[PDB]
Amino acid sequence: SEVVKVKQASIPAPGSILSQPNTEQSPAIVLPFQFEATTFGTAETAAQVSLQTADPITKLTAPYRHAQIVECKAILTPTDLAVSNPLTVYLAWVPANSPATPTQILRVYGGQSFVLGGAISAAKTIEVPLNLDSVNRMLKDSVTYTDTPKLLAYSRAPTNPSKIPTASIQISGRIRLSKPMLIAN
């Protein structure tokens, strides 16, 4: 009632991995995480958040060599300001190497459009989960991948620009770190 989950587009594209867990059972740990991808309302927002390089996720996987995603999902959050200043957001999880750009989302299989601002519509948070069968689960490995999940988001330049965001995307989930990496403590 206060949260609604809407899946994206179905299409298997598993990627490839490292068959390093041959006769190994290296202890791993599962960490939850959640940060702020972008904000809407200040001005035309059209950012592309790559999970592999986003600071918050990095510093999380910093001391490890293998970081694997277990679950992950984008969360659209409207605020009171949205109630009177409608706006439309465009999400679409796509693997990093896709030539898709924020401005042309609807033109990629899975892009969807929401209308958070609703002055009539109910103000509930939307939840678009990442189908990690469409991209590559590995954020950080002994090899660099190209099917890394990337978040495409966009929203036309506002009519009544506000210095206080009207909507924000959050990206939460759980990672599986393992095989520590020597760093400077």
Q: Which is nearer to a copy of itself, 7 or 21 (CB)?
A: 7
Residue 139 touching a copy of itself (CB under 8 A): no
CA distance 39 to 20: 39
Q: Which C-beta is closer to a copy of itself: that of 21 or that of 53?
A: 53
Residues 84 and 34: their CA atoms lie apart, in Å, by 28
Nearer to a copy of itself, 21 or 154 (CB): 154
Q: In angstroms, how far apart are the furthest CA atoms of the chain?
A: 60
Question: Coil, strand or helix: which one is 103?
Answer: helix
The tokens for 147 are: 């099917």
Which residue from 21, 25, 68, 179 is in contact with a copy of itself, where contact means CB under 8 A?
Answer: 179
Beta-bridge partners for 149: 95
Question: What 3-state class would DSSP assign to 49?
Answer: strand
How far apart are CB 69 and a copy of itself at their closest, in Å? 8
Site for a copy of itself in 84-113 (CB under 8 A): 84-95, 97-113
Taking the CB of residue 4, how many other CB atoms lie within 10 A of it? 11
Report, in Å, the least distance between residue 30 CB and a copy of itself.
6
Residue-wise DSSP of 5-34: E----------------SS----EEEEEEE
Within residues 12-71, the interface with a copy of itself by CB under 8 A covers 13-18, 29-51, 53-56, 59-66, 71
Query: C-beta of 72: minimal distance to a copy of itself in Å?
Result: 4
Shortest approach of a copy of itself to residue 139 CB, angstroms? Answer: 12
How many CB atoms are located within 10 Å of the residue 26 CB?
A: 11
Interface positions, 153-172, toward a copy of itself (CB under 8 A): 153-158, 162-172
3 state SS of 121: coil
Between 21 and 180, whose beta carbon lies closer to a copy of itself? Answer: 180
**Shortest distance in whole angstroms from residue 21 CB to a copy of itself:** 14
CB of 150 to a copy of itself, least distance (A): 7
